[PDB]
């Protein structure tokens, strides 16, 4: 039968599942058609994390429900600040995984700390891409324009934006 | 000889939103494996880049690459005729002067043929994405949306810090 396994890139795969399918096997029907490897996989429906050996029947997961597929990575603080004349703003976020609805989770791999500034008029244009994807990928670097990216059902929309120097 | 059919004109209407508001023109390279589009903003600080696969159209057929540079402000107008769930269809010939846009909805209900006259825009495609970036994060797009939106009230310059 037809279950949907959502990805944290906006891409939710409609896998075709049987209630007598073991968890190990979902994690495989996944790796099969989308490349993911079995030991990274973290699937999270209904507020619970899924134990390999358990059959999906073991979790009462019927047709057209949804788990959430989420990758943690073998291999702390995102901060956004604006600061001006009238005053100053600060939103601080941290990487986590949601259980009830993981599509809200914050992924982060940090290779080096980054500290960059960008024109707001540009960012204001950029966030319009919300209306194409639940989620947005963001790539920052001191050596190059930052990438912002909404994925489409097969394809994507990208915004490269150069940081300011001073 | 392009004939490309979105099952719902909403989508393409959305995608063009992305360009509107920050870029005037855009070449639209159609290929046998789909559409891709590049536009640079005026101050050359922002590049918008778009990729659309065959799997994104209801039907797609383009047995020859063709380029369609177009006025976005013009094209969006034409896209208000959209109603959002109608079947949009782009069509073009060997050497194109006009691209034809073609809406039609439930049945033979309604049908509306439009033409956008194309302009010569010089193709200077950029390939600026790096292999490695210091840092990478994903997060709900409207969360981001909210943050950018709030901090824009205080300051012309939002600055990001990861640690």
Swiss-Prot record, chain A:
Protein's UniProt name: Proliferating cell nuclear antigen
Subcellular location: Nucleus
Organism: Saccharomyces cerevisiae (strain ATCC 204508 / S288c) (Baker's yeast)
Role according to the record: This protein is an auxiliary protein of DNA polymerase delta and is involved in the control of eukaryotic DNA replication by increasing the polymerase's processibility during elongation of the leading strand. Involved in DNA repair.
Family, per entry: Belongs to the PCNA family.
Reported modifications of this chain: Ubiquitination is required for UBC2-mediated DNA repair.
Source lineage: Eukaryota, Fungi, Dikarya, Ascomycota, Saccharomycotina
Subunit-level organization: Homotrimer. Interacts with RAD30. Interacts with MCM10. Interacts with UBP10.
Domain of life: Eukaryota
From Swiss-Prot, chain B:
Post-translation changes: Ubiquitination is required for UBC2-mediated DNA repair.
An annotated Gene Ontology molecular function: DNA polymerase processivity factor activity
UniProt-annotated location(s): Nucleus
Cross-link Glycyl lysine isopeptide (Lys-Gly) (interchain with G-Cter in SUMO): residue positions: 127
Single GO cellular component term: replication fork
Keyword tags: DNA damage, DNA repair, DNA replication, DNA-binding, Isopeptide bond, Nucleus, Ubl conjugation
An example Gene Ontology biological process: positive regulation of DNA metabolic process
Superkingdom of this protein's organism: Eukaryota
Record-annotated DNA-binding residue ranges: 61-80
Stated family: Belongs to the PCNA family.
Record's function text: This protein is an auxiliary protein of DNA polymerase delta and is involved in the control of eukaryotic DNA replication by increasing the polymerase's processibility during elongation of the leading strand. Involved in DNA repair.
Complexes and interactors: Homotrimer. Interacts with RAD30. Interacts with MCM10. Interacts with UBP10.
The protein's name in its UniProt record: Proliferating cell nuclear antigen
Species classification: Eukaryota, Fungi, Dikarya, Ascomycota, Saccharomycotina
């Amino acid at each position: 039968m037809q279950i949907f396994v959502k990805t944290l890139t906006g891409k939710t795969i409609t896998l075709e599942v049987e209630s007598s399918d073991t968890i190990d096997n979902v994690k495989s029907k996944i790796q099969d058609k989308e490349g993911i490897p079995p030991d990274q996989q973290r699937l999270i429906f209904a507020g619970k994390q899924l134990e390999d050996g358990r059959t999906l029947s073991d979790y009462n997961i019927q047709k057209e429900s949804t788990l959430h597929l989420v990758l943690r990575l073998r291999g702390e603080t995102i901060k956004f600040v604006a600061d001006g004349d009238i005053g100053s703003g600060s939103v601080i976020i941290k990487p986590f995984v949601d259980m009830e609805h993981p599509e809200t989770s914050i992924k982060l791999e940090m290779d080096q700390p980054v500290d960059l500034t960008f024109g707001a008029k540009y960012l204001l244009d950029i966030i319009k891409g919300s209306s194409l994807s639940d989620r947005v990928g963001i790539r920052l670097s001191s050596e190059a324009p930052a990438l912002f990216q909404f994925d489409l059902k097969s394809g994507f929309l990208q915004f490269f934006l150069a940081p300011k120097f001073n | 000889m392009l004939e490309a059919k979105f099952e719902e004109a909403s989508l393409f209407k959305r995608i063009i939103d992305g360009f509107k508001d920050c870029v005037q023109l855009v070449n639209f390279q159609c290929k046998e494996d789909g559409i891709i589009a590049q536009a640079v903003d005026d101050s050359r600080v922002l590049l918008v880049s778009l990729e659309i696969g065959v799997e994104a159209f209801q039907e797609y057929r383009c047995d020859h690459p063709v380029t369609l540079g177009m006025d976005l402000t013009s094209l969006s107008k034409i896209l208000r005729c959209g109603n959002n769930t109608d079947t949009l269809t782009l069509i073009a010939d060997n050497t194109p002067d006009s691209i034809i846009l073609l809406f039609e909805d439930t049945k033979k209900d309604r049908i509306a043929e439009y033409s956008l006259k194309l302009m010569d825009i010089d193709a200077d495609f950029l390939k600026i994405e790096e292999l490695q970036y210091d840092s990478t994060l994903s997060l709900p797009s409207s969360e981001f949306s909210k943050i950018v939106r709030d901090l824009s009230q205080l300051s012309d310059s939002i600055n990001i810090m990861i640690t």
